[PDB]
Amino acid sequence: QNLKSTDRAVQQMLDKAKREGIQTVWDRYEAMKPQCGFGETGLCCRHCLQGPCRINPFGDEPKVGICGATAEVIVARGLDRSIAAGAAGHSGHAKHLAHTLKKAVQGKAASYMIKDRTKLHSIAKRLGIPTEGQKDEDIALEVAKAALADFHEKDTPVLWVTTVLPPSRVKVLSAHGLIPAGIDHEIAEIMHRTSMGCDADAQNLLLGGLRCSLADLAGCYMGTDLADILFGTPAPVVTESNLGVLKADAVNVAVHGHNPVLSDIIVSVSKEMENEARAAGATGINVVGICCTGNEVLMRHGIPACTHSVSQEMAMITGALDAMILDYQCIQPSVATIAECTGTTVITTMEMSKITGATHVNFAEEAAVENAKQILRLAIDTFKRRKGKPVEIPNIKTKVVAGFSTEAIINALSKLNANDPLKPLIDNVVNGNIRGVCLFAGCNNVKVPQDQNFTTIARKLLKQNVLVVATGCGAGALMRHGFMDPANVDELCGDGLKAVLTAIGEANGLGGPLPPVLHMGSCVDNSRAVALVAALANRLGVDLDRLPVVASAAEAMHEKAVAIGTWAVTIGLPTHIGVLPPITGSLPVTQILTSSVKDITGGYFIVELDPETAADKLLAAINERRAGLGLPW
Amino acid sequence: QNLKSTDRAVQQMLDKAKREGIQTVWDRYEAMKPQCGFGETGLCCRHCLQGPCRINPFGDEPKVGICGATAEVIVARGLDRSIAAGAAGHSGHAKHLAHTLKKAVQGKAASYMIKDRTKLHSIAKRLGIPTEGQKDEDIALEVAKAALADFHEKDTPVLWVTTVLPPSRVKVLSAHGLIPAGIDHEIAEIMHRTSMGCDADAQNLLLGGLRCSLADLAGCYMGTDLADILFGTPAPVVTESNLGVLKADAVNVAVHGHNPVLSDIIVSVSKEMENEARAAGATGINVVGICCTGNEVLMRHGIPACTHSVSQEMAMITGALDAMILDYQCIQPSVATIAECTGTTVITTMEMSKITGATHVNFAEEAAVENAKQILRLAIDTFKRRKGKPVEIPNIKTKVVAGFSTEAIINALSKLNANDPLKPLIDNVVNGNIRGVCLFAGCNNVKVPQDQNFTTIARKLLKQNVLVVATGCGAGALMRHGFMDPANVDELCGDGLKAVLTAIGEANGLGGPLPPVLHMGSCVDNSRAVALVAALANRLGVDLDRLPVVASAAEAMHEKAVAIGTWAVTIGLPTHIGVLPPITGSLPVTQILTSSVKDITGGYFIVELDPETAADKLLAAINERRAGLGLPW
């Protein structure tokens, strides 16, 4: 089972699933092998009913699609649609939060409110919205209107791009025509240009993809901005992760998906139902996280994270998961059938994401508290039904220090230099105590033993004094393996990094270092890493493609991960991806994405499936940036 | 070659291509066989980097995707993305025309103007825009603003749906949640809901598809509305079709693509360059049409149609095609490589649709006349370079009577009943001289001998007194086979239909009947058929699902054709498709689309690849509607 997952709790549940005959994601993967090589390389097209068209990577015919589409075109069109799909997900999440904010301040949903007034005013100021003499509710209405306006064409470009990157970066992108005109506008233009008989030039297609990836970035940044207004900006928090956070004697409720608009409410209501939970024989309601909705409630409230990504079904295999409350994205639909064998109540809540066989509760912000109580009552009913049933919760968990929003990081550094908080970080980059910054992002993927690339790469970088930040299921992988426990700093960190983590920690009262890796939140909260890197760029007077900052989607899966990787490249970062995207069928497309894009945006993809080699390549990319700044490395 | 195309001119060019060694679409199809059965049935997913996933139609594993996605989910997600892509194309075309109109009336592009003031005011009235006391330019600005506003969420739903269907139909659709909230909003929500780990219920997915198909309808109707304001509403016109419309002694310039914003200008400028063409040794500039941009200029100006769809490369094989001027959609990218062997100058004009190896001219409405002259000068240069080269233009052409906009049809019928123009049509439906109405729409497809299904089905329906209307490449197929020549009415039409076509023709001065089939325009102008059918519905006080009206996408190919077929179903029509969409891998999805959707919208798909059988099925659908109205059949 260590060939399926490096997580010992997951391995234990894989053994239980095997003896109980419950099929898992790894079993379904095995049943899919050998997978189609045309699809894996990108050399398949189904964009019209003359297809499917395939092209042999090598050899004889077919060499070209029926309409004449070349391998270059086919691969670039497929990739562009994946970017658009990812942008559609992140920006659908942001759009939902925009409507939620508008409702809150129009007095239509009093379960929601402006919790972070400081963040509201700073976002308003960034967008050019006047705050002097205005009611907070009016400023917020303007912010939510601006958010909605970035989805369509208007007299300005997408402000959640142009106001969040350095002017010099905006200028470079504008010169190449890459600034998005509107988020849903770009998604639709991708779907148009990639349909049959339209764009058929790889460079032109890929430029469109880069622009659509910035629409994804805008959705991510908008989502983080709106969620912080509504739910609070994260600050350091201490919690736990892995399946041992489930408690046999409690009602275990997982929040799973991406958008916390309902699961933030679940967290609140669950505490006010502690006595109703007790009347049913439980100690309490134990809300736990899965995937990014879990990250959201971890970062804001310290809710423990049960599991992530590819291993999500394992939480149900314990027998102790009374409810799984779903919104959208990255939810394996197998959960609805597994639930019949495990006793879990799987509940969908969003109209555009239902799963056959799950119970649907139509969540409305207007009714959030009532809907939450209905859902938790189902979970309580379920707890009662498992009276007397043995459960097998692996007694395995890690300590997690998290909550490192960009504001939190700036505040932590400000204890070393109150009026120039970024300077202590920069000083330690210059002197080499911090070699550079690496962001780990993205999913797990069944093709890769779970977490093996995140942990292997992170260990090498941390020994070389790289400041490692993480989001999403990359943060999930690292937290489940102890990378967010400060007790592991001596083992994992080089001496320079340890010194910096210790100096900042001790200056923040902790009598101990910051954790080895800083958890910056959910996938949309990759936008927080952008905010940090852009602030560093501003403070140094250079663009992001001169900073010693890299990204790694070390185990990517979702179309959203492709979008994030592409915008990381577009904003100027060397960007590692540790699974193969469907590009190898076209050398010209591969060469653009891994090399000639450098001449457009300064960033580039590093495709490398061997994680030791990827770490070396990421270090070389960091060290090249250091050399370009005239720094030792 | 009659196994490739039923068009004799195409067959002649296929022989020339074969002896010259020029590969065609049919050759590329042959090289693709056998095609992938997983893709053909819909049982392939590439929505995440754990794929590709395939499901065996029958037999053993794989039975489910890696994430747990069932065959039902996989098939419904694929279909929904095709609908979204089609909506993206039709509504990208409409959006372009909206911006063109706005520019025209803001004084930014004086090559464009309000040509149809009556249509402008009627559209304004339909949308609720005041016209009394307003400058036309201000009414138009309001109409273009409204057009742009339908792309995004706002306080009203998409007006180019809710104001163009009967209230009773709007009510049925609203009750099922099917009215789109915004065109690009729906496209993005489809891309989101279909991404990994989101919507996983076939009925829910398909309802989303139906709603997105109405966003496609809105784009089509918007496109026709805006093009009529700018370029004029079609009225009856007489021209010719097929390759014999090329002239060896002239500069032959094909306009090809969909959006006529530039090719309407090409038509104008070409006439003012007749003397510059003569100085170069030509008789003149002979503008000819391909595909739907060709239909647009045929309907408005009588420009002859050279060819359509699958046979587009054959126009180049003649050796006499000096330029091919491209916008977007349905352009085989092979044209750019064929042009090196045929001497044709292939010119792209739109930023989001380039083809490697073609010459790009950046068209701007602000510069339309200048850009057109640059392009035509290239075509003239090309004509000169073929001084002395033999050409082989098949001496094959048909006479085409076209220009039957809905306004034109109403006007024609008004000569039989001035103040109740629809009543003569209804009277003849009731008495059986007109059995019903069939709309032929969509593309040719290399899988089907070109035009064989359109002509086979149309012949059977016309003998059974069906009034046949046609758009797009369905109109192209029928025009190239003589179905738009009134001289063929005696051979093709039943006695009842002949009597009606003759009565209307003779009442319009023609001393002869209307043609056997009425050409209602381009693919967006499927919206004109909706306008006609909705007006009939209004006049009878029933909804469209009670009218004896059917649709047939008899040879479909493009994602746009899937969108049109789906909205034809959604508005209440029995809708034949004569190629297999990728649905047969899921019986539940097939059953929804061909049967249980009847209980939602009253329409349904009829999937039938044998064209004689399809005609019988379409007649049975018409006759069932007649029976439901208590009429003989």
Ligand code: SF4
């Ligand atoms: S778009 Fe071209 S390559 Fe794709 S399926 Fe259609 S014919 Fe084949």
Ligand code: SF4
């Ligand atoms: S979304 Fe599911 S079915 Fe599709 S490729 Fe990914 S794992 Fe396979």
Ligand code: FES
């Ligand atoms: S041929 Fe396998 S992915 Fe299309």
Ligand code: FES
């Ligand atoms: S396996 Fe052939 S279309 Fe994917």
Ligand SMILES: [Fe+3]
């Ligand atoms: Fe995910």
Ligand SMILES: [Fe+3]
């Ligand atoms: Fe993610």
Ligand SMILES: [Fe+3]
């Ligand atoms: Fe992910």
Ligand SMILES: [Fe+3]
């Ligand atoms: Fe993630």
Ligand SMILES: [Fe+3]
């Ligand atoms: Fe994830």
Ligand SMILES: [Fe+3]
């Ligand atoms: Fe077409």
Ligand SMILES: [Fe+3]
């Ligand atoms: Fe069409």
Ligand SMILES: [Fe+3]
């Ligand atoms: Fe078509």
Ligand SMILES: [Fe+3]
């Ligand atoms: Fe067509």
Ligand SMILES: [Fe+3]
């Ligand atoms: Fe066509």
